[PDB]
């Protein structure tokens, strides 16, 4: 046998109910117990038999978090006077982009594999003389785990990666893609950390303390045109094989810092004319 046939679940159906007159009171309960009532419409009114074929397939965490989302973008020039402006250096983190940040912060602990995709585009900077002929460009993406050497210029020796993984990509082809496993020292990623760094309750406070994922560096391999050219890189993350624990309420206030929970007080919700107004 060279083939294995690994080879679903619909919502609950509604059962028929007739008139009732008894001492049982399903409608009456007590929320003080912290228990959410499990009543169904069949307990309060007469209902017909209905077979439901709806499924909750699209509400699973795997599908909810299984969408690529932008997490960072930066620009770097092929040639310029400032050395720091010819390459990018980004400390990896998921708190930069608001949509993905809020999506992730609905759970306290996460454990998943990651799929990273890079989108790179280039454009010629405005200027008087734009007449030039330049072959196709090539880019290098370098990942440096924590503690490794960091390049200080575009043509530094550190770009000769011998152990650090890297990707060389040429313009005009499909976007680069790659997978990365679960690389946390702990048993799961923590979106929130209520604690300090030092043992005497001092120093850094918050999730910043647990961010030790490394850095990413990007440069033009050898392109140096007579006239400046600007390139932009976009990083997309896509969790795979996800698991989550301890859900928490979604955030209500707008984000204001990339490494803190600071916020400004916000009203609970919008207002209306009065408690009885029901019209538009």
């Amino acid at each position: 046998g060279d083939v294995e046939e690994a080879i679903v679940v619909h919502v609950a159906d509604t059962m028929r109910s007739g008139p009732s007159n008894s001492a049982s009171v399903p409608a009456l309960t007590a929320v003080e117990t912290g228990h959410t009532s499990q009543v169904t419409p069949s307990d309060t009114m007469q209902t017909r038999h209905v077979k439901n074929y709806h499924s909750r397939s699209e509400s699973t965490v795997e599908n909810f978090l299984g969408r690529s989302a932008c997490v960072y973008m930066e620009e770097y020039k092929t040639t310029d006077n400032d050395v720091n402006k010819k390459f990018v250096a980004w400390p990896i983190n998921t708190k930069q982009m608001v949509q993905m940040r809020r999506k992730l912060e609905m759970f306290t602990y996460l454990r998943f594999d990651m799929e990273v995709t890079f989108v790179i585009t280039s454009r010629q900077d405005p200027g008087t003389t734009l007449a030039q002929d330049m072959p196709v460009l090539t880019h290098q993406i370098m990942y440096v785990p924590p503690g490794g050497p960091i390049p200080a210029k575009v043509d530094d020796y550190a770009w000769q990666t011998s152990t650090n993984p890297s990707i060389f990509w040429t313009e005009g082809n499909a976007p680069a893609r790659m997978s990365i496993p679960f690389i946390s020292i702990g048993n799961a990623y923590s979106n929130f950390y209520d604690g300090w760094s030092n043992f005497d309750q001092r120093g850094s406070y918050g999730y910043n303390t647990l961010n030790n994922l490394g850095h990413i560096y990007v440069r033009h391999v050898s392109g140096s045109s007579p006239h400046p050219i600007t390139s932009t890189i976009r990083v997309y993350f896509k969790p795979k094989h996800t698991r989550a624990w301890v859900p928490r309420p979604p955030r209500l206030c707008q984000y204001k810092k990339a490494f803190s929970v600071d916020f400004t007080p916000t009203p609970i919700t919008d207002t209306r004319k009065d408690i009885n107004t029901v019209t538009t």
């Binding site: 929320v31 306290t108 005497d200 918050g206 999730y207 810092k257 600071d262």
Partner: protein
């Protein structure tokens, strides 16, 4: 009758005559660490009855203008009995807890309290940007008070009650384990919290496992009467506590 409950830990006992049932964390009872999940090598110490017992914290007054209070654990019990000593003398710790909050009033009083345990209740500063010492949210067993208006002092946490200092809707805290103390039908709330963390054990002085919050959602009211306030008391008891990593004391 199911309105009477009795809990016995160590050499202490709690008896309540009017009470709802007990909420058990996320359906998991506290338990010791397994051999296939541990990481530390040396033998742990399991002080049992010595540490697994009820401790009474200071009591607070519930006025007509109260807004709420919070406590952070285990920093609240950091200086209580032998539990505090074991915390001081060890590098790693692990323990569940049982929380019992008590509030009694006559049949002519009205009000409602929300009791909830929030794991990893990270809080933001009053001024976005500045930072605070480890004194604006935890200074032992003393209770910290929420505020009706927006906080302005830069040295303390944002105490806006409707945001709960976490930037989330106060009404959505129902997702966490919780109970309601409604003076009509209830006098106490009981919650059993298992050890929840991303690692098998942890330093009890550096990390706040969870935060306890009490929020009046229906302000206290009464008429006439010689009673001017309703005291609130909180009792906690570690369960299945064990420690590891004997170093010198002093936290």
């Amino acid at each position: 009758s199911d309105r009477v409950r009795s809990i016995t830990l160590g050499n202490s006992t709690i008896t309540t005559q009017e009470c709802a049932n007990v909420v058990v964390g996320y359906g998991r009872w506290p338990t010791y660490l397994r051999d296939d999940e541990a990481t530390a090598e040396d033998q742990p110490t399991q002080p049992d009855v010595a540490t697994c017992r009820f401790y009474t914290l200071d009591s607070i007054k519930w006025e007509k203008g109260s807004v709420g209070w919070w406590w952070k654990f285990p920093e609240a019990l950091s200086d209580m009995g032998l539990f505090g000593q074991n915390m001081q003398y060890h590098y790693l710790g692990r323990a569940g807890y049982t929380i019992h909050v008590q509030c009694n009033a006559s049949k002519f009083h009205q009000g409602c309290l929300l009791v909830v345990c929030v794991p990893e209740a990270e809080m933001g500063g009053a001024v976005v940007g500045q930072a605070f010492s480890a004194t604006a949210m935890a200074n032992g067993d003393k209770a910290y008070e929420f505020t009706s208006a927006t906080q302005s002092d830069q040295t303390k946490v944002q105490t806006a009650i409707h945001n709960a200092g976490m930037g989330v809707g106060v009404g959505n805290l129902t997702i966490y384990p919780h109970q309601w103390i409604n003076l009509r039908t209830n006098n106490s709330a009981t919650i059993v919290m298992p050890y929840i963390n991303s690692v098998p054990m942890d330093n009890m002085f550096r990390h706040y496992n969870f935060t306890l919050m009490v929020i009046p959602f229906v302000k206290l009211d009464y008429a006439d009467t010689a009673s001017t306030y309703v005291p609130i008391t909180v009792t906690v008891a570690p369960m299945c506590a064990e420690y590891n990593g004997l170093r010198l004391a002093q936290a």
